[PDB]
Amino acid sequence: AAHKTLRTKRILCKAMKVNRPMPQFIRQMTGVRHIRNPLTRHWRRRKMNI
Amino acid sequence: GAFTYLRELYTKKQSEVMRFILRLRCWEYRQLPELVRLTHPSRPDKARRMGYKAKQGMVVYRIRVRKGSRRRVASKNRQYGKPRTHHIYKLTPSLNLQAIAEQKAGKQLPSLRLLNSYWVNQDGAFKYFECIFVDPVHPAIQHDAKLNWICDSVHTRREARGLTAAGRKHRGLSGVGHGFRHLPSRYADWKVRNVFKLRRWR
Amino acid sequence: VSQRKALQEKYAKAKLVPIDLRKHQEKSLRNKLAPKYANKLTAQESRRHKCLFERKFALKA
Amino acid sequence: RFPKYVQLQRQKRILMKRLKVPPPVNHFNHTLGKDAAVALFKFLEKYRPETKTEKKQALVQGVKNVTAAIESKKAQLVIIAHDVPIELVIWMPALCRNLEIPYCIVKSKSRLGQIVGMKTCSCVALAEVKPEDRAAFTKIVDSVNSGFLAHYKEEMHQWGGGELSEKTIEKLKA
Amino acid sequence: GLHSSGKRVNFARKIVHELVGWQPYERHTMDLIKIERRRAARQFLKKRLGTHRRAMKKLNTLEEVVQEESLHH
Amino acid sequence: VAKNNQIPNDHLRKYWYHRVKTFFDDPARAQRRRNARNLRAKKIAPRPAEGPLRPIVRCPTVRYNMKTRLGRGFTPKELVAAGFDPALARFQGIAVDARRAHSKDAMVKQNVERLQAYKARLIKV
């Protein structure tokens, strides 16, 4: 960046909208506990390698 | 009849009439490419022995195989391991040159079933072979009780798996008797002998 | 489905239909030839099958 | 310039002239002349085989069927197309020499096509002939025997061999 | 009866043989029989044709061909 | 090698342990065979399931001249003597073998009488 391609930009979009906390209502629905979002990361710690 | 005489002419290839005719043909074949189509087969009598019948769907193709044996494949002619297996040049292929002729023509022409091949000519450099092919989807071969066995999907590329007449020679399937007892398949027979069997009562 | 039932009636009962209106099937089953052609008899074979068919028989008690 | 296949056609024609040809293959080169060859076709023309739909509801017209007539000794005379694989008709002459059948060796395979009603033919022969004609036929059988009398004296130890160019001949006489 | 008794095939073997003629090794063998070296000639055929019984058949053929030329010459 | 045992002869130097063949199929194999020949005999009906009929035949070598077993099929000579049509007799439920022609006069008289007992009480639907 800048000067990213479009299909590069498509991946970086999907990588940041997927990065969030898990919703509250799944724990209320299924009753499971201790499920983490796997595709959470931090930009500084883990690099994507894409 | 007529094809008595074509047979008995072609027995005596090494003679001044026949050796003249073969050189003129072999001149023409050197100028043309390797795999090339014919309209009709150069040897009509020998074609019908091997299964050619002149109707729509049956196709004929000349092909050129290089004479001599095939050398081993090595990087910079290096050989390793135990010195019994150090040769390069005194190798021979286990396939016949007829088989290598058909197996080149198979790779170029899929969608097309090899019935059989036969010899046409040779010189110092190359042999020449004239492979019969079939388009099995064509109605004339899709019909007809004698030929339509080819249309079944078991016979897709026989030349790869060695089920031609030339194919059956290298496999040693051309004989019956004491010598040929070991080779269903050379391999299939070997496996039966070598499988270790543990019967349930012992 | 109002289109297709109408539009199939136009091309039904006619040679070489469109690709949409052909039935689905498998690859293997299309290219396998119809069992009449596989099973059809040679003029030698049919004429002997006049006499040498797989006839019924039985034994006495 | 010349797209290879054109270059092969011409080289193949010249290479047949330049080589020492064998005598049997060579015998094929000799042919009936256009005086006599026109007359011969009329007999054939009269006896032309029937086409389909000209069927309601004469002539032997192929290599396999003509050999049946020759080996039976039914054939009055044979006709052979001058050019064809040469292997198929080389021995037509050796048979008809042996069994004392007279034979033409007529130019063009294609015109033997046209008269029969196919693209090619390479072989024609007449078995029965007709009571109505016959007389016309004798003149033609005499013309073939008297006409080819010139050739088969020569041909048996003849080699139609090296023609040897124009520019090669100039270099020799240096 | 059910035997072949080959007239028609063997008639075709004659006129092709008259037309084509002899093959290189048969001409070389016929030259050795003209010189009266019959024993060297059978050694030549045994290398070419391979076996003994093949070779001695071809001599008994080729001796009859040379003795036909004795009546002609 | 130790003690008084016989020389160690075990043909186990190849990797036999990759090419193992255990026969736990055998009693399930028995049923796959058995359910086939019942699904035969219903389809073959009304024809007899133990057939087709086969000849009595002497075994070859010196140490089985005594014994007599079932062959492959009757000769075209033995059928015509008994009163049968060689080609059609395949479909009457009699196995036929064109090749065998070393059977001498004694074993022909058995196999003619064998076919006559069949042809006596064969009947047609």
Add this chain to the structure above:
RNA sequence: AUCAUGACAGGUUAAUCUUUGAAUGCAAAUUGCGCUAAACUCGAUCGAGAAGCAUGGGUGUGACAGUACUACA
């Protein structure tokens, strides 16, 4: 949504079937660069979309090339 004009996390079959991939209009670390008789559909004769267009080989059909063979001029 209830004795049915039939609830839905049921099970098939048939539609619809994004960008790709053998990937096939030509390419590709590019949302790059094309082409088309009618019909189709909006668009007001003429634009657009929709849908087409790959290579190889088979049979048929047509066209071109040749001082290749031949007859009649």
Add this chain to the structure above:
RNA sequence: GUAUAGUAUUAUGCUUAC
């Protein structure tokens, strides 16, 4: 493959193979 001189083989021409 081929044409010609000489002792089946040596010599130097031919081109259409190559």
Add this chain to the structure above:
RNA sequence: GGAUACUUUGAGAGUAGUGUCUUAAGGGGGUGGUAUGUCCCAUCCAAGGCUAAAUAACGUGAGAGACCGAUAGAUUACAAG
């Protein structure tokens, strides 16, 4: 088929295959486990093609157990390739 070279076999003066050169006969040819010629006897007729069943199954999909019982059992009993 023969000579020779290589690979291959229990096949041994070659079991099979292949390269190179050479190359038959057809009132005849192959085989009969020691090379070679030779005389008998026996048994088959190569160099083209099709063909169910019995048989195989460390892949994939969908009842049984003297097996393991969360450091075991599959790498994975769970948002595990």
Add this chain to the structure above:
RNA sequence: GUAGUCUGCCAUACGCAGGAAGACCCGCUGAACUGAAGCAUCUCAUUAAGCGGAGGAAAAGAAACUAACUAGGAUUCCCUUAGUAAAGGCGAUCGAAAAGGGAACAGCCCAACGUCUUAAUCCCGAGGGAAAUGUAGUCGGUUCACCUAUUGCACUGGUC
């Protein structure tokens, strides 16, 4: 000049090929660790990996086969023959077949050659095309015996 053919190349109409999977199957290619208490022939092994190609099974298959008899009779597999005949720095090791018992059992047809059949054949759907450089058909003739209809593939859910 035109009218046939032969050969080549281009364009087009209609169905076909490719890729996945690869335990089993078919055809090639091809190791070494290891054992021989070293090591080079030999062994591991005509194995692993590599290349090419099939099917629900594949491949094989209707005698140029065994045998030496009181004779068997396509192919495949199981038991035995046999750790034998044989092979082998005759060391290490390696190693079959006929017969016998059993599972299963089914035979067929091109070529040419009948020195005959006026292509009698096939594809396309009124007629075009392929084919005589060869498609199709029982060798011909007398005379008694006899056979006459079935055979493959396909087969569905629910209630108590």
